Amino acid sequence: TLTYDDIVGTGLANKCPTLDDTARGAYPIDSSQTYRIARLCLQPTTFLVKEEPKNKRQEAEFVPTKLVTRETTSLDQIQGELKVNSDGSLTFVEEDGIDFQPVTVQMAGGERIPLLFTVKNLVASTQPNVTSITTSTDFKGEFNVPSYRTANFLDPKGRGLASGYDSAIALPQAKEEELARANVKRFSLTKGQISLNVAKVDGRTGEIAGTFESEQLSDDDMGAHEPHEVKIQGVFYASIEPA
Amino acid sequence: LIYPLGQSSWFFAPSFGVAAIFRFLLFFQGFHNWTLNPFHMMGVAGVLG
Amino acid sequence: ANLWERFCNWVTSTDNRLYVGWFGVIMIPTLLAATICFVIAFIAAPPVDIDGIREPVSGSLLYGNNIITGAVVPSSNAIGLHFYPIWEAASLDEWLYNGGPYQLIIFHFLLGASCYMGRQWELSYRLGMRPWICVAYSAPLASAFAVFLIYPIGQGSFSDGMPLGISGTFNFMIVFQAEHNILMHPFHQLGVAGVFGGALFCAMHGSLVTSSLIRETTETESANYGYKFGQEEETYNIVAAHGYFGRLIFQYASFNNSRSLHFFLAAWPVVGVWFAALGISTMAFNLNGFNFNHSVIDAKGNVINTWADIINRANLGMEVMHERNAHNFPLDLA
Amino acid sequence: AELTPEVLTVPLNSEGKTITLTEKQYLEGKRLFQYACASCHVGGITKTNPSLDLRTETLALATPPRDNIEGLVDYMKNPTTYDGEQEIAEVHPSLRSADIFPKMRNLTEKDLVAIAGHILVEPKILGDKWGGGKVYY
Amino acid sequence: KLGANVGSAQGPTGLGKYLMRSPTGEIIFGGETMRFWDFRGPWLEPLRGPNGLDLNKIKNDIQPWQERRAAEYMTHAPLGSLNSVGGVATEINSVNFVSPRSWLATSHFVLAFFFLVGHLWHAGRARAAAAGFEKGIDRESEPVLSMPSLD
Amino acid sequence: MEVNQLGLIATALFVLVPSVFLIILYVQTESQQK
Amino acid sequence: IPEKLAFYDYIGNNPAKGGLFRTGPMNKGDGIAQAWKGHAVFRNKEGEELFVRRMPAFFESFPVILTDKNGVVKADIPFRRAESKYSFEQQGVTVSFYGGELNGQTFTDPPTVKSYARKAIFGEIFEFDTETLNSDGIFRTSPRGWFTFAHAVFALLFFFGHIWHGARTLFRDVFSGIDPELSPEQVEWGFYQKVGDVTTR
Amino acid sequence: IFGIAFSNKRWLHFFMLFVPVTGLWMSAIGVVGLALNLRSYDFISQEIRAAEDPEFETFYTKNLLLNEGIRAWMAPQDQPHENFVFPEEVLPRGNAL
Amino acid sequence: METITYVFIFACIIALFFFAIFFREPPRIT
Amino acid sequence: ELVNVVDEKLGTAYGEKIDLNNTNIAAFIQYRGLYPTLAKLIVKNAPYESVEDVLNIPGLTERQKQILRENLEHFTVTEVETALVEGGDRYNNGLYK
């Protein structure tokens, strides 16, 4: 069992736990029992950003990027209710945890794309009739993506939404209209989508691990410009417990 | 002399005192952005040089 | 002579157009590295997240700066005092975003300038000179250390080291005033006495020597042609200069000993600047300027403001505005 | 202007009774407050919880009322949350927790009255400065 | 205590208001103190697990003595004026405090520096005197005069 | 960036005019009989 | 009220509002003035008249603060919103125009009212053409300013000219240097009774 | 050491006059400008770019935010004849401080 | 155009350093 | 067209009373008996369709219900404003003294 001093500075702290290749078991669900996810961990391994084509009617693709904000990207220590539904499907309802990370990736040619990588308010369901969680079990759901900056955030000219100036004070007599979009801050709230593919199950401990893919919009700079579409892929880990 | 004669009154001249002078420096930063001035900068170069 | 011996003789040779020397052997690569990285970064570096809050600041010319606004931006607050060489980054794009150029440049530079000082000693010794020119150079060198290394160490981050640019310099000064009240610190005050005094005495000495030049030329030629490189006689009449200055003030306020005078010219700005450096280096550990906020109080107990309190209001403006997005808790404790 | 007996007259309790502090008491109150309280409460604010200050109006709206000598002395003996609901001696200096806040060990009843008197008198002198924070410096 | 879920609280910049990751992923305190994540102290360590600050321990296991200690230390930070007025530079007179850590650090930096200066002085002088020109250049034997011109 | 459109020629002539003045004086000093 | 007179009561025409490298005509900043909008009168929901605090020349920027006739603050544009008590929205601030192009009109929507209040810090409010000259909206000084600057500077420099030439005049005999045969006794204290007078040994 | 050196003592001493004297004279000229508020306060190009683009930030814009802080927080007491009353809510402040 | 100007002036300065050091008028003892 | 939603919310009862659905928790210090216990329950159990719904919070002592009844006149409710409730801003909105 590793301690903080074993781990510190290694990069292991941004990684999710793995299960061994001998973990292809089944975790029985008692439909009369209540369950919880005690720990959900999401470790992204690739960020893809959809390009914005000039003709606007060409099959736009998701292209690879370079992470510039280091090993600060994983969501972890997340917990919530795991409900058994009438039709035997299971629904995870996210309650709390470290469920967001600001992340900046850089596209070819230098463009930087900040996003709030997140599963905030995740609600994710399996297929009907999951009497046991197995390597065939998958979860799909939606979550919220609130503005990458919160309401107090001030731009470099000191303008903001819940604080700051409401005009371009260095241009005292400019016409206001062409600056409206920069002057009047707006707070975005959109939806993201995610799938979790179970690859490994320890039926005894109640631990599962696998791969995930999520999709969400990136930072729109409090309304100053359009967000990009982002697709995030990686691995996950979760501990299931009767609650 | 010339600096306050250009302004509203003698009030905005430097007052003769240590901390008072320090206040003059900070006032010039906040209101005049004096560090940005190439004439001040040449002054700095001449003093340190 | 063997190869190592010949190499040593060349390195320490008094006949090289620019002296190399053993200190030079370290100085030359380090100064080149810092210089080359600084030039490229100043022109072409992308914005840097100086305060670790994903709020990149643009320093380079190609990214919207002029000579006055441009800078090489300090490394990220997320990094703190951690060593961040190129090979600690996953990529150059990362290295750049986090302010790696800053660390490369300041570390190579501080080493190289330390070696420049050593080299001044070394050449003084090869030439049969007295050795203390290097000691004079210790004054600006200590000052560079203060703002590039000691202050960061005390505050826990290279993000608080002085930026490598003109406006960045001013930013550093204003924040320093908000956080340490440096103006009210006696070491900074000695620093000002040192540089004002230096400029004064420079002008003074210039003007006295110039005033007492001995007639050796006509009116249609520069008086400078009256001195010839390596002539044995002094080119001005010091007894006359002293005759003037001693009467300008009084006799015993003027120097009649040239050695004493030049010693004074060396000592005054050097000591003053030593204290300037020590001001920054001790405020690094948050022992700050004199604080007389509300020191004067009337009979009931009303606060009677002094100029110290007006200074305090200005400092408050600076304090509440700086790094407007970086504080989440009420006290700025570094 | 002077520190008059009127300025030094403050509510003893909630029932309209007042007490008049001596100048020596005022001085003692400033000294003891700096000694045991200013580290958090300098200027009438509260550094570890700025939402609650030492303004007379705030203290008046506390439960039980804290805008009089009795209320304050009691607070220094058995401090509560703003609504009176929880006893917080374990995390706030008091006589009850003088074991873990050793600076309270030598505070006498006379001392507590002096501190209370200070907390009440100071805003009569400084007005909005007291509990005002840096905006009013 | 007021009811905030401190693990999920996103601050204004997008980073955690209370909690964030170090550049290697460890859970650390957020805000400017992100720089000080290498700090270790007995009052903090019981909240630390294998990946850094532990959210469960934070939510469930913080003891009143930890709160007391953190308050005490937060309010005895080593900041203060030359005349020993405690706190930031803009703080009013009231608290007579300059941290011993500051007195010791500043005093020993000043002394160490002047001692480096002294080293340069006496080393340079020792060299010059051992070689025999610490009192100046021999007019009849000026070394530079027997050297080839630089150009 | 929306810079002042006279800045380029202002800068060029600022450099060129006095530099050329100095170059003229230098070269004709050199060509004087040695 | 003549437009010319209203126009004088506008800070854009104040010579102490420019910048050293902000070049050209005043029109290049705030624009070419076309018309007086008329006089703006601000009122709160209670119908009390409110007065915008004017910008003093010292300030590049300035807050927006409205007081009653007795200087009591009644409304403002807040920075931090969370504890705002004087917002135009809370206070129901309106603005009505008298004279000029907007004469007889009243505005009640907070954005418009606030915009006019921001203009009111400059004194009387005008419509400008900012398109003809591509004005950048930043104040420039007038010929009063430029003349004053150039002539104070040139005067100061000419002081140096005076010192230099007066010196050259009065010390012509020593300007290639001092006498090579300067006797030490001429600068030695006490030797001459009157300084530099050889007849007073 | 440095690549160039003085060789003429008369020139050296004149230069010692020239440098600090010329520096002080230049500072004086700038102050005459400030007498009229004829400042070097801004770079117009910077302000146009910054006003349109909320992600563009330089040390120049940062220093201006500091100046704004100075003016608002120091003015009421420093300029008492103006009778400034700046309600708390209008005071410019970053987060927390 | 601005950046070119700044970089150009800088480049001329470095060149000038080169000439002033290596192609200076040699100091001669008379 | 573009609107600052916070400024806009100041023109509604949010700018006049404690909004049980939006206001930051420190505001509950304004009235006797509300902080911290009730304030915490109230923010935790938001949002409410009307003010009186605050009386239906599970676990309330009789005293608490009476304190709440006495304070209903100081409460209001509006639509939850995302910008005011995200980031945990109801528990700490970046404002101290």
Ligand code: CLA
């Ligand atoms: C004089 C030559 C010289 C010196 C002293 C340095 C020094 C440095 N370089 Mg630079 N560099 C140089 C030339 C030099 N450089 C050249 C020519 C290039 C182009 C190839 C570079 C390219 C380069 C890059 C890309 C980077 C550096 C970096 C560094 C820093 C970290 C070095 C390190 O970690 O090595 C560790 C090596 C050792 C500890 C070996 C020491 C072994 C000795 C024999 C024993 C122990 C000595 C002890 C430590 C102290 C000795 C005391 C002394 C009195 C003897 C350090 C300031 C990095 C940096 O700036 O990070 C911020 C960085 O990213 N360099």
Ligand code: CLA
């Ligand atoms: C390591 C050195 C050191 C340190 C860190 C301290 C620290 C302290 N002393 Mg102690 N003390 C010291 C040496 C030291 N002292 C010495 C040498 C004496 C004999 C004078 C004393 C006698 C003494 C008394 C009587 C008292 C203290 C007190 C204190 C406390 C308050 C200090 C204060 O307010 O200073 C004020 C700051 C100054 C006076 C500034 C001094 C600036 C110096 C002169 C600059 C020197 C620079 C450099 C050395 C010169 C180089 C010149 C260059 C040309 C080469 C503080 C903990 C007080 C206390 O609280 O006790 C409980 C107290 O009453 N000390």
Ligand code: CLA
């Ligand atoms: C501030 C830096 C510095 C400078 C410029 C000097 C200069 C000098 N030293 Mg001193 N020295 C220093 C610090 C310094 N020293 C320190 C801190 C110590 C204590 C360990 C010494 C111990 C010492 C001894 C024992 C001797 C000298 C001597 C000398 C003189 C002769 C040249 C020599 O042998 O140097 C040797 C240089 C050093 C010991 C340190 C030089 C440090 C500079 C900064 C170069 C460091 C570059 C390093 C190799 C790069 C590492 C990079 C890293 C990434 C690996 C010369 C005046 C000699 C002398 O003649 O005295 C009379 C002598 O015998 N010094």
Ligand code: CLA
């Ligand atoms: C007394 C002198 C003077 C004054 C006060 C004016 C005033 C005016 N001019 Mg006129 N002008 C003048 C002489 C003057 N002019 C001369 C001599 C010319 C021929 C070149 C002109 C040609 C001219 C044109 C073509 C135009 C004007 C315009 C204007 C108006 C705008 C001014 C402006 O933007 O300046 C800006 C001022 C500066 C940027 C200050 C520059 C300061 C220098 C660079 C300092 C240099 C420092 C030095 C090198 C350091 C040496 C150091 C060394 C000693 C060690 C203003 C009313 C404009 C207008 O609006 O016309 C309708 C316009 O288009 N003027």
Ligand code: CLA
């Ligand atoms: C630092 C200031 C200064 C200095 C060092 C000099 C130095 C010189 N001047 Mg110049 N001068 C100056 C300022 C100065 N001047 C001013 C401001 C003017 C007015 C434009 C002049 C007008 C002037 C002329 C016309 C001539 C000189 C000449 C000279 C040279 C000979 C000495 C002389 O005539 O002094 C002049 C004497 C004084 C400057 C002292 C005047 C003291 C006044 C009368 C006191 C007034 C008190 C006042 C009434 C109190 C109330 C004030 C009110 C605001 C309430 C010498 C180089 C002469 C020259 O170059 O010959 C070759 C020459 O012909 N000066």
Ligand SMILES: CCCCCCCCCCCCCCCC(=O)OC[C@H](COP(=O)(O)OC[C@@H](O)CO)OC(=O)CCCCCCCCCCCCCCC
């Ligand atoms: C290890 C190598 C370290 C040095 C490398 C870089 C050195 C560069 C030094 C300057 C060389 C150019 C000097 C030209 C001028 C030149 O050749 O001067 C030569 C001149 C020689 O003096 P003399 O006494 O011989 O001249 C006598 C008569 O001819 C006078 O008419 O030296 C001086 O005047 C010293 C005072 C001026 C010194 C100016 C220092 C400038 C510092 C740099 C400032 C600008 C930097 C801007 C950065 C963008």
Ligand code: HEC
């Ligand atoms: C910091 C470590 C503190 C010291 C030292 C003292 N006090 Fe305090 N005080 C502190 C906090 C965090 C709080 C809020 C407590 C809570 O959760 O409710 C307080 C509160 C008070 C109050 C009540 C304020 C009010 O009702 O508006 C009083 C009257 C008070 N404190 C007084 C007080 C005195 C007299 C002290 C010195 C002996 C003292 N406090 C020390 C934090 C700290």
Ligand SMILES: CCCCCCCCCCCCO[C@@H]1O[C@H](CO)[C@@H](O[C@H]2O[C@H](CO)[C@@H](O)[C@H](O)[C@H]2O)[C@H](O)[C@H]1O
């Ligand atoms: C931005 C545009 C800049 C354009 C730059 C143009 C550069 C022009 C270079 C011209 C060089 C002239 O070169 C100059 O030639 C003269 C002779 O002709 C030389 O002069 C030499 O011969 C002359 C002529 O008899 C002798 O009197 C003199 O004693 C001797 O030194 C100079 O030593 C040399 O400096």
Ligand SMILES: CCCCCCCS[C@@H]1O[C@H](CO)[C@@H](O)[C@H](O)[C@H]1O
């Ligand atoms: C010889 C070194 C020249 C300087 C090289 C700068 C980085 S390379 C540079 O990077 C930009 C940002 O990603 C790209 O947009 C651009 O196309 C590319 O040329």
Ligand SMILES: CCCCCCCS[C@@H]1O[C@H](CO)[C@@H](O)[C@H](O)[C@H]1O
């Ligand atoms: C949406 C804004 C409604 C109120 C109109 C703005 C105040 S008035 C406005 O000010 C501009 C300078 O900023 C001038 O260019 C313009 O001529 C004028 O109409």
Ligand code: OEX
């Ligand atoms: O980083 Mn740069 O500046 Ca030294 O205090 Mn804290 O941190 Mn930030 O705030 Mn103030």
Ligand SMILES: [Ca+2]
């Ligand atoms: Ca599967």
Ligand SMILES: [Ca+2]
């Ligand atoms: Ca335009």
Ligand SMILES: [Cl-]
């Ligand atoms: Cl800043």
Ligand SMILES: [Cl-]
């Ligand atoms: Cl913080």
Ligand SMILES: [Cl-]
């Ligand atoms: Cl309050």
